[PDB]
Subunit: 359 residues, 4 copies
């Protein structure tokens, strides 16, 4: 159990950007710029800095060339410069390794703290950032699949309750979770900015990065991404979806970048900003919890995720989950799911929904 | 099947299906309360339903009976005389016909039913009772509104044989699915200038694969899925939602209380020019049925509705001997590709996206 | 009135393309390609040939550089090559001037007949056309405002009944119209392809071309055109809309090209293919007939339209409408409209709505 | 100038609900429930408590039968019970009339403070509220025009700078505003919850309530409201729109209830929660500031607004704006607006855009 520090938590606004290490920068730029339409804030031979249509901070995604694809940092914006000091004190009290750079780790960010957090994830906290042209009314640029915001991260970690407590102390509130009737938590979603999530925990071997999520305005924009992927004959890079989530109630799509970093495209979750926002707990065997329409969750969605780096840039060693596996208990050999609680009709025993089994 | 000397009836479009249903109240709940179709007439025996933009009496007749099945798939013809032409055409084909001057179902007049050469019960009619066209009744409009009847899809063992017959009847092939060794797995064909009025799916038959209704927009289809989740009947969402390859339409397949399959469809393309370019897809192309490469659930290939003869008895099934689309794509000896010739993004002995057959 | 020929009418499939004369080709190209996203089928220093997303024939729009902006031809595809000969015999019997070019008037069209029709409009009939790549699944090209089909033309003409009967003899079926209780017809819509319209007649001084219309898939695509025009700071070229039509039930927008040629963007009218398709007549004073939400129709919509050319390329002289003016009876000083017939609440007298 | 209290401001979460006095409870029910599809949390013979599709607090709208149609309370929810204490001390230091009830003024709200604020508006602050079934996944109920959230209020007040300063001291941050080159402010928008607005000031004679705004998921849902109103042959109750706003970038529609209370339907503005969120100032003569597509703003939109009540339920006296009138300077007889700054082409003199 991760103790609550005496030192006050930094006041975190929102998820702000991810730095992903990529192996072939030109290939990755083709994906995020040509395919997905993100806007270039800056690039050179080593990095690409990208932002969403409605962003005014410098970037929402930095692609950094390196030998091993991995998450290098997941960055949260804090409310004041002094919150960066607070973050440093808070993580030092937690016994975590920290690194402070007054002029930033990446271009367009100023004073910044990176930490190896207690779950082994590389978090950044910053306030200072170079404002850029906010493109929110640049409909001359707007794509049929336009990514309008950065929405959230999702982290794979072996012990969800341990992580959840730590994130709650840091001021995130859990909006939804997935549990069973035997005490196991499989996943949790938690926010600062008043949407369903700024980050999220998925039970599994970790630390690994499950995905980064961008929003669109409307559901047809997500459909267009799928359609465009078909036209580009890269439909094999559509992992899962499109669908309606149970958890979050968002319309969603998961796609895979050239280094298999998973990207979620997301729209129309709900307001969570009230402090007594009702926490929704879904049962792990409810077949409408992940896809509301009951479509089966591909096994890769549970098993595959990106490496994460330490502050030296080396891959963090993976710690195996010992709690029950969501995959196993729902679609595995001894798995079970239901459409209606207590009804055998529309239930699935040892296989996935809709007539499929694990490959 | 030979081309008759007699002229084909001039067919306008698919118009309505009569489905036999076993429990009329449960079927009513599905078609009216879940799907929002509009009642034109009902009694203890039948429910007559129409789509939002329709002016003819109905697009769907649900008839209570002992064995769920397709009883008639009906096409409207251009003139009263075309019913006489249909009768002569099918008589020359040596098919059983039955003519009723005052119709088989309410709101249809002079009508001919035939057991066609493929074993399917076709109706041809001109005369129909017009009703209030609800197309601007936005006070009634559902978030999932079904706006038109679009097409039928028929399961039949020998696709080329059926195709040639429909071509003689004036349907024109728009798209099809073949392999490199000359097998045909499916064909789509039209009269009204959309991708299909009816379509042939290779398989044991005669069976009715589905009846399709349109929506205005893609979000309307999404809403049907969402509503089915809220009603906790997501298990009746068979396949989708998706984008089709063939037709380019956004789609969904759902199952009614008797397992009759309904497609919801939108935004296919114009085919009314006589030299409309045909499109042939390779059976192993994993974008042909779902453009996004999502797997086709095996029930989509195997399950379909019984059809009746003109006495109300079930038509006997003839087995397909040509290769099975399921088997050559997603079975244990199957394969499909994302890019022709590329092993990356290819699937061998299983479906796309990491699933095998359950 | 225009007598029915004994010669058989050509079998007309649909509206197919318009040739518009434009004064500055590069400015026109910016509007139709860069703003509206139409797809280049051919271009040179004198002409740009453009098509919609789902088209397989060579083009839906030809922009031709010339001294005077005008409609040069409104072209219908016919069902067979022999239908061009039928069109020639038909228009000759009508006493109309015709010109036949076996190798076409514009690139990508073959054997073609142009006529000065009885209403003074330059019609073209052709069958042969060069097929091109049908872009309907090219979602790598698809714009947020994508124009997917050519839908129809709309013609200003002084005597709507006279034109309507002529078009009916040619096989067009009227789907909707606007009339009053005194028996005046103000507009009619008519089709071959089984939508609400391939061409339409608006009562006014003519021959003039009121608009060319393109379809989108969905209503948001039309919204995007407006939003894009705002971002390009050319919102002054949004003439009317976006709205829901009463007539046609379509979602719509009217915009103006650099020569003030009017383009409609249109989606989601209904099927009219059955021969007893019910015809809808609206009362001219019904304030929901043109915009279903009761938004006012700006006067320019009724008064402004494009010149049309004769076969020598000279502008056709205009004949003034003598029947009542829809503008005058609805939004002019002695005009009126209602929301609910017979209710003075929601009625407008001597001005427009809202 | 309204002074900044020594007392700390309450932590305000968001706009939460409005209480509207209406004259015919059945006709108002028909509008809000049958036409617009809002969900009934509670009703009796005197009041109807309505909520949006995604709401979990008891209600977003209370219709209260009474003799004079008016805003009775615009309510904001605060972060903690102790913030209702903070509110009370804050408004007392401002010399405002206050009234606190530990068991609420309306059903479904607990300890609540109502005030006559320095601009003459009845504000309520509360934390405690009865939770109800959150209908956000009830797609069996979802309307083609579904109203999903309460988004904001908009207030008519004669002196916008004066009001703006007061709201900023209260913790609202200005996101967008409308000014001219002569030092006049015509409108401002300001937020707590990280959208463009929780309330907004429109320069005019006041206090009056300009509108209450509800969100939809998508733009087509707003189009459907218009289409439905045509089918019901009540298109005359569509005042303005649908449109794209300049200010806020939201897709919008303004309609009128049976007592002429103005309702906005709104979707797809942007995130403002960062504390250095860039302000956007529009010039009052820019014809894309209110409707981005340049559609004219009808004069009633500027002139008409709802009465508001004091804490005794009497109508607040209206104070006249003496600053320049947005109507007059843009669409009046000596008005002006432009499409492109400095371009005569596409400008309008003494008249509204589009003919
Ligand atoms: Ca258990
Ligand atoms: Cl999920
Ligand atoms: Cl398919
Ligand atoms: Cl109109
Ligand atoms: Cl505005
Ligand atoms: Fe996610
Ligand atoms: Fe189909
Ligand atoms: Fe038109
Ligand atoms: Fe507003």
């Amino acid at each position: 159990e991760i103790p609550k520090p005496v030192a006050p938590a930094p006041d975190i606004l929102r998820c702000a950007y991810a730095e992903l290490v990529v192996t072939d920068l030109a290939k990755s730029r083709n994906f995020y710029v040509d395919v997905l339409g993100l806007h270039v804030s800056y690039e050179d031979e080593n990095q690409i800095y990208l932002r969403s249509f409605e962003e005014f901070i410098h970037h929402n995604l930095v692609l950094t060339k390196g030998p091993v694809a991995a998450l290098k940092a997941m960055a949260f914006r804090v409310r004041t410069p002094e919150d960066v000091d607070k973050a440093e004190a808070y993580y030092q009290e937690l016994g975590c390794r920290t690194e402070r750079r007054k002029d930033g780790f990446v271009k367009g960010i100023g004073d910044a703290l990176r930490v190896e957090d207690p779950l082994g994830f590389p978090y950044e906290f910053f306030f200072e950032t170079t404002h850029v042209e906010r493109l929110h009314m640049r409909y001359d640029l707007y794509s049929a699949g336009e990514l309008v915001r950065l929405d959230h991260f999702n982290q794979v970690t072996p012990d969800v309750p341990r992580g959840r407590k730590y994130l709650e102390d840091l001021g995130f509130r859990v909006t939804e979770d997935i549990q069973d009737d035997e005490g196991t938590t499989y996943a949790a979603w938690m926010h600062r900015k008043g949407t369903v999530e700024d980050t999220a925990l998925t039970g599994g071997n970790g630390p690994r990065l499950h995905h980064v999520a961008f929003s669109t305005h409307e559901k047809h924009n997500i459909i267009q991404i799928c359609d465009k992927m078909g036209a580009l004959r890269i439909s094999d890079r559509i992992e899962r979806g499109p669908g309606r989530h149970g958890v979050s109630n968002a319309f969603y799509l998961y796609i895979l970048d050239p280094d298999n970093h998973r990207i979620e495209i997301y729209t129309q979750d709900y307001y969570t900003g009230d402090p007594d926002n009702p926490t929704i707990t879904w049962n792990v065997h409810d077949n409408q919890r992940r896809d509301w329409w009951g479509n089966p969750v591909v096994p890769s969605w549970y098993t595959e995720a990106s490496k994460v780096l330490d502050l030296d840039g080396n891959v963090q060693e993976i710690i195996e989950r010992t709690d029950d596996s969501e995959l196993e208990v729902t679609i595995g050999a001894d798995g079970f799911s239901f459409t209606r609680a207590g009804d055998e009709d529309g239930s699935y025993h040892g296989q996935a929904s809709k007539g499929f089994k694990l490959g």
